Amino acid sequence: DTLPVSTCPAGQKYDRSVCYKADKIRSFCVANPRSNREKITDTPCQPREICVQRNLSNGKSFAKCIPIVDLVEWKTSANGNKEGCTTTSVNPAGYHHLGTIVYDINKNPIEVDKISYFGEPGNVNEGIGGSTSYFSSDNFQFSKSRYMKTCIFSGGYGNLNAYTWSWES
Amino acid sequence: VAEHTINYIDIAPEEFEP
């Protein structure tokens, strides 16, 4: 519901946005030529929202806040070196992605060694990403019999805060 | 069966994803 700010000073254009904190979007304007005058805008989420991040069809980062009740909040394994997972159906039936972002206790995005997605039943590879605080699955045909497992392997700190949401383009 | 069911599907506004 809370969107990044797309407006920029004259001579500048919106370029991308990232989750600066779990509760703060950060948007970036760019000038031509590039300069240090470029407007960077921080947008707070509402307290019931969490910032989620993914890459758009053009490769640019896009961040926005979604109500936590509208996605899956989960904890990564207590032992950072243990891969832990959660499973999610998405309504209605159809082709959707999942995205996942991981935060540490200070509400900072934290890179994890591996985020992997498995279509179920069958443990079908639906995407593997590494050394990243966020990562999205392939486009997967969800249905009453088809759902998706998301696995996080931190490789460092455990008990991290993960958020898994669904999206389409 | 899955542990969770999602009932909200995010789509980026056109002004960001043309």
Query: Could you give all domains of chain A from N- to C-terminal order, each with its CATH number?
Result: 12-68 (no CATH), 71-167 (2.60.120.1050)
State which residue of chain A sits closest to B12, comparing Cα positions: A169
DSSP3 helix / strand / coil % (chain B, rounded to 5): 0, 35, 65
CA angle A19, A22, A84 (to 5 degrees): 105
Give chain A as a 3 state SS string. CECCCCCCCCCEEEEEEEEEECCEEEEEEEECCCCCCCCEEEEECCCCEEEEEEECCCCCEEEEEEEHHHCEEEECCCCCCCCEEEEEEECCCEEEEEEEEEECCCCCECCEEEEEEEEECCCEEEEEEEEECEEECCCEEECCCCEEEEEEECCCCCCCEEEEEEEEC
User: Can you tell me which residue has the tokens 């904190």?
Assistant: A21
CA distance B6 to B18: 26
**Resolution for this experimental structure (Å):** 1.9
DSSP class of B7: -
Q: How was this structure determined?
A: X-ray
* Cross-chain CB nearest to B2 (options A66, A70, A87): A87
Q: Which of A154, A138, A162, A168 is nearest to A71 (CA)?
A: A162
Q: Do B6 and A89 touch (CB under 8 A)?
A: yes
CB contact under 8 A, A70 and B7: yes
Torsion of CA A68, A131, A128, A123, to 10 degrees: -70
Return phi, psi of residue A107, to 5°.
65, 20
Q: Do A56 and B12 touch (CB under 8 A)?
A: yes
